[PDB]
């Protein structure tokens, strides 16, 4: 349950980051830059959790809808295919979620973001990028609470919608343990910010929420978010 080791982990990967842990409304901070936890960063793709919630609750889409790829080149070849909301969730396929955001529209999206009170709750005028380059910003502490509420089905949306989004977030399942989460990586801002937000469902159903937030660099493999999370959750004996 320390705290200096976990500091060494961040130290070793030459990054600046924080790991926010929330266990039944008790919050703990870890990593090598704890002041990040109350610092506002753009959510990047972590916002997909909320985008989906808003989209499903307002019936702009459903979990079965197949989003058609219409041929434009995308940032990743893995994105160039028809997919569902859930598939797009697993791949962080931005263009699908931008299509969703456009269906929702600026009015509906702004209203929802403030009703939920997400981060600074400002989305500006472009409904299809506000979470990648601003103006929307959120603290890693705000994210762990958000995701904690989602895990407990406590967000101001219908339970079926929350359960549908939770089902899209399963990352690993081993030894009676479940890890749910969403990565983010805002590459077009400086400094770059990487996220891994989610929760652990322990074999007895106890839920432990986490929000990893770290400064990123282009040379980094994306899986560095996963490694820094996974070895920390092991140190704290959460898995
Ligand atoms: Cl602490
Ligand atoms: Cl520190
Ligand atoms: Cl079906
Ligand atoms: Cl591109
Ligand atoms: K250090």
Swiss-Prot record:
Post-translational modification: Carboxylated on the epsilon-amino group of a lysine, with the resulting carbamate functional group serving as a general base. Probably N-carboxylated at Lys-48 at neutral pH in vivo and undergoes complete N-decarboxylation, at pH 4.1, in vitro.
Top-rank lineage group of the source organism: Bacteria
Subcellular localization(s) per the UniProt record: Periplasm
EC assignment: 3.5.2.6
Induction annotation: Expression may be regulated by promoter elements associated with upstream insertion elements, such as ISAba1 or ISAba10.
GO cellular component term of the entry, any: plasma membrane
Catalytic class of the enzyme: hydrolase
Modified residues (N6-carboxylysine): 48
Gene3D superfamilies: DD-peptidase/beta-lactamase superfamily
Active site residues of this protein: 45
Catalytic reaction list: a beta-lactam + H2O = a substituted beta-amino acid
Regulation of protein activity: Inhibited by the desmethyl carbapenem, MA-1-206, via a covalent binding to Ser-45.
Subunit text: Monomer.
NCBIfam families in the cross-refs: bla_class_D_main, blaOXA-23_like
Chain's role: Class D beta-lactamase which confers resistance to the beta-lactam antibiotics, including ampicillin, and carbapenems such as imipenem and meropenem. Acts via hydrolysis of the beta-lactam ring. Has penicillin-, cephalosporin- and carbapenem-hydrolyzing activities, but lacks ceftazidime-hydrolyzing activity.
Family: Belongs to the class-D beta-lactamase family.
Protein name as catalogued: Beta-lactamase OXA-23
């Amino acid at each position: 349950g320390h705290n200096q080791v976990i500091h060494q982990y961040f130290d070793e990967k030459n990054t600046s980051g924080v790991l926010v842990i929330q266990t039944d409304k008790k919050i703990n901070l870890y990593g090598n830059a704890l002041s990040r936890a109350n610092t506002e960063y753009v959510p990047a793709s972590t916002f997909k959790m909320l985008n989906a919630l808003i989209g499903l609750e307002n019936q702009k889409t459903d979990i079965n809808e197949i989003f058609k790829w219409k041929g434009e080149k995308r940032s990743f070849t893995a994105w160039e295919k028809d997919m569902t909301l859930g598939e797009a969730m697993k791949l962080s396929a931005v263009p699908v979620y931008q299509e969703l955001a456009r269906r929702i529209g600026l009015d509906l999206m702004q209203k929802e973001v403030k009703r939920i009170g997400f981060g600074n709750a400002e989305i500006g005028q472009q409904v299809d990028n506000f979470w990648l380059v601003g103006p929307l910003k959120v603290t890693p502490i705000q994210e762990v609470e958000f995701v904690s509420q989602l895990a407990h089905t406590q967000l101001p949306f219908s339970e079926k919608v929350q359960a549908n989004v939770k089902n899209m977030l399963l990352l690993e399942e081993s030894n009676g343990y479940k890890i749910f989460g969403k990565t983010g990586w805002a590459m077009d801002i400086k400094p770059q910010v990487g996220w891994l937000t989610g929760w652990v469902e322990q074999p007895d159903g106890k839920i432990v929420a986490f929000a990893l937030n770290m400064e990123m660099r282009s040379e980094m493999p994306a899986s560095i978010r996963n490694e820094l999370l996974m070895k920390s959750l092991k140190q704290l004996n959460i898995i």
